[PDB]
């Protein structure tokens, strides 16, 4: 009875509002819940922090409480929590995460600095619970150069944000101070952390030079061939432009990769409105890392989606489920330019135009006499899995504007999506289908009577059930994004988390969730 009503409350997603009745029920049993880590955030929610005596008692219980997971602590950094001791406790729990996990949350943690104390951040500038979020991140960045790289670029983009600057100067000034504190901590560090500062400086001037080059190509008119030759000439002039021969600097898009420079003679522009450049970076070890450099575009919505897809890919792998996804790197180097990792691939629309069908494509580049449908069993297994993975992930994220030009394919059988300009349920058309599945994908795996389609359906159920188990973490991260300058979030900041929460159907048992996902696929198929 009373015990059952608590377990329902405790198991709520982190963003659901407890009723008055629910809050006072949680309070009454506060002492009966101290060994349930998943109930601590529910308790903290129901505390009148206004009242000193109750706040005292609440902090006592926070001390005696079974410590909460790192994933749940992310909730305490959101805008709904202002008590300093609660926010310092969140940081203390975050300290238990290793750097691989921390890096996967970094984009959101940088947004959460909006919810920190701005005076503390400023006051740390030279003219257990002892660390706020800013001090924590700078401290972790000074020990890991990959963390430092992303901290720098994440904060630098929030600094240049002209909407924030005009519309919320206090928050813009905080991010300047965050960057000033970072620089200060780097200069006070040992030779290791001190050289990191100049590596960051070298990356920044390289991007400025690249930005300047893109503009130079576009100064006068010319056709694409003429513009490529301008691009190539300017890149090869290293005295002038200095982009083809640099001292092994980290690549911002992926700082583990050290770059000697851009290869001048293989750089070209894409045929599109913004004419982003395809650029091959020379690696310290003689290899090539292809990127797209975009100028005149805000990559931050793409950056968020690819960060989330990367996270979901890792969660699934943690569960021994590798769906062959393609979480390509995206890094905004400004609100107006950025990098994307280039993946060798071909749009499905071009597959249909040239080979007539996904199956024909596979039979041309990966045949197998005894393989399924004459296709390499290895390639077919890669295609079924990546279809299942992307069907579930784009459903959960409500990605829209899906067509055969932003569905991409590799000769190894990987299918993946690109261009996430429409998310969280926005779409150019009204009444879009909930499962982003089409007739070309289903024919690609042999149609709906095939063993592959069965496998695809099962991989969809598995993926959905696993990601459901991580709904708290995923909902928490999204709740740190509700004030970000990301267009599809800023449209309805107060409905964003709910939009993602609903997709998990946390109201269904696992048994029921699998039936639902089965009907989602069949109904989408029946409609195709
Ligand atoms: Cl009520
Ligand atoms: Cl009181
Ligand atoms: Cl590590
Ligand atoms: Cl704080
Ligand atoms: K990352
Ligand atoms: K660095
Ligand atoms: K990849």
Curated annotation (Swiss-Prot):
Subcellular location: Midbody; Late endosome; Cytoplasmic vesicle, Autophagosome
Residue numbers of the full-length protein present here: 291 to 870 of 887
A GO molecular-function annotation: phosphatidylinositol kinase activity
Region of interest (G-loop), residue spans: 269-275
Name assigned to this protein: Phosphatidylinositol 3-kinase catalytic subunit type 3
Location, primary (coarse class): other
Record keywords, A-Z: ATP-binding, Autophagy, Cell cycle, Cell division, Cytoplasmic vesicle, Endosome, Kinase, Lipid metabolism, Manganese, Nucleotide-binding, Phosphoprotein, Transferase, Ubl conjugation
Ranges for domain PI3K/PI4K catalytic: 263-528
Region called Activation loop, residue ranges: 417-438
Annotated tissue distribution: Ubiquitously expressed, with a highest expression in skeletal muscle.
Domain annotation PIK helical: ranges: 1-178
Assembly information from the UniProt record: Component of the PI3K (PI3KC3/PI3K-III/class III phosphatidylinositol 3-kinase) complex the core of which is composed of the catalytic subunit PIK3C3, the regulatory subunit PIK3R4 and BECN1 associating with additional regulatory/auxiliary subunits to form alternative complex forms. Alternative complex forms containing a fourth regulatory subunit in a mutually exclusive manner are: the PI3K complex I (PI3KC3-C1) containing ATG14, and the PI3K complex II (PI3KC3-C2) containing UVRAG.
Post-translational modifications: Ubiquitinated via 'Lys-29'- and 'Lys-48'-linked ubiquitination by UBE3C, promoting its degradation. Deubiquitination by ZRANB1/TRABID promotes its stabilization, leading to autophagosome maturation.
Catalysed reactions, semicolon-separated: a 1,2-diacyl-sn-glycero-3-phospho-(1D-myo-inositol) + ATP = a 1,2-diacyl-sn-glycero-3-phospho-(1D-myo-inositol-3-phosphate) + ADP + H(+)
Family per similarity comment: Belongs to the PI3/PI4-kinase family.
